[PDB]
Design a protein around this ligand. Structure first.
Ligand SMILES: [Cl-]
Ligand SMILES: [Cl-]
Ligand SMILES: [Cl-]
Ligand SMILES: [Cl-]
Ligand SMILES: [Cl-]
Ligand SMILES: [Cl-]
Ligand SMILES: [Cl-]
Ligand SMILES: [Mg+2]
Ligand SMILES: [Zn+2]
Ligand SMILES: [Zn+2]
Ligand SMILES: [Zn+2]
Length: 298
């Protein structure tokens, strides 16, 4: 097998209704889990939405054997300016292509049988017009880098990702922890990496014993640690441990202990209905409207 496993990409969601509809009705993905969070407030809670946020996992199957989207919704935040850091997710589905066509959701053929589309927020998805394969339709996430060799030294020498493809001349590498996982594509881009406000995070699992040594290695090597090892709670569900890191271009990386994460990430059959009930009950847009002020921007 592999110790380390590609889990998900965090997407900052302005409009949850429109995001849920794109992921269900265009990509043909499903709700795996839905969790409503309340952080409370440092000072007096300003409005009924302060510290209130949701996490919805969407993808083609259980998180154990699929790479999925972590839809992060803050009830008080309505827009995120998208930079050039996240270049898209590529997946194989003629079903998604048909869905887009039937729903008149714009599609652009960028190579033979490959259709570029945009989720709400401008996040790019690349749809291969071929049959749903006999496993996870998600093939890769592509991230922009300023200095390819600097990025390979980080992602390969420090984090232990294998090189499936490397092209110095095209300034591109395809990395992965295993054949049966989502791959990470690094693409040298023009004009620097800009994270703006929509910047997400790529999550991997390792055995929990590796978390403190992963933190130490990054300290020793002078790499950025965004969040030292910490326990994160989810209402009515397992506590996991995370270290949050920053690659050489500042892409956020989450490492989480696999053994407890597998208890947290059980596919919840009620997830879809919990999302629909929370959306039916979300009057945040009407609240901000009556207060004559917008949701914050990322
Ligand atoms: Cl669903
Ligand atoms: Cl009020
Ligand atoms: Cl599968
Ligand atoms: Cl699947
Ligand atoms: Cl994460
Ligand atoms: Cl997570
Ligand atoms: Cl009100
Ligand atoms: Mg008014
Ligand atoms: Zn599957
Ligand atoms: Zn996550
Ligand atoms: Zn009011």
């Amino acid at each position: 097998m592999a110790a380390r496993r590609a889990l998900h990409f965090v997407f900052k969601v302005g409009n949850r209704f429109q995001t849920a509809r794109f992921y269900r009705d265009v990509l043909g993905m499903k709700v795996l889990r839905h969790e409503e969070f309340e952080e409370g407030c440092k000072a007096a809670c300003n409005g009924p939405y302060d510290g209130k946020w949701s996490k919805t996992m969407v993808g083609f199957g259980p998180e154990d054997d699929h790479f999925v989207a972590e839809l992060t919704y803050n009830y008080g935040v309505g827009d995120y300016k998208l930079g050039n850091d996240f270049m898209g997710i590529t997946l194989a589905s003629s079903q998604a292509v048909s869905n887009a066509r039937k729903l008149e959701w714009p599609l652009t053929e960028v190579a033979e049988g490959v259709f570029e589309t945009e989720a709400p927020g401008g996040y790019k998805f690349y749809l291969q017009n071929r049959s749903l394969p006999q496993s996870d339709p998600v093939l890769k996430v592509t991230l922009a880098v300023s200095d390819l060799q600097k990025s390979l030294n980080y992602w390969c020498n420090l984090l232990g990702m294998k090189i499936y493809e490397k092209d110095e001349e095209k300034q591109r590498a395809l990395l992965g922890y295993a054949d049966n996982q989502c791959k990470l594509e690094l693409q040298g881009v023009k004009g620097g990496v800009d994270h703006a406000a929509a910047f997400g995070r790529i999550a991997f699992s390792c055995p929990q014993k590796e978390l403190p040594d992963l933190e130490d290695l990054m300290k020793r090597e002078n790499q950025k640690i965004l969040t030292p090892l910490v326990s994160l709670d989810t209402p009515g569900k397992a506590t996991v441990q995370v270290v949050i890191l920053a690659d050489p271009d500042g892409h956020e990386i989450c490492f989480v202990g696999d053994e407890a994460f597998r208890e947290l990430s059980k596919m919840d059959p009620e997830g879809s209905k919990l999302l629909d009930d929370a959306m039916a009950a979300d009057k945040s847009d009407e609240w901000f409207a009556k207060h004559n002020k917008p949701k914050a921007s990322g």
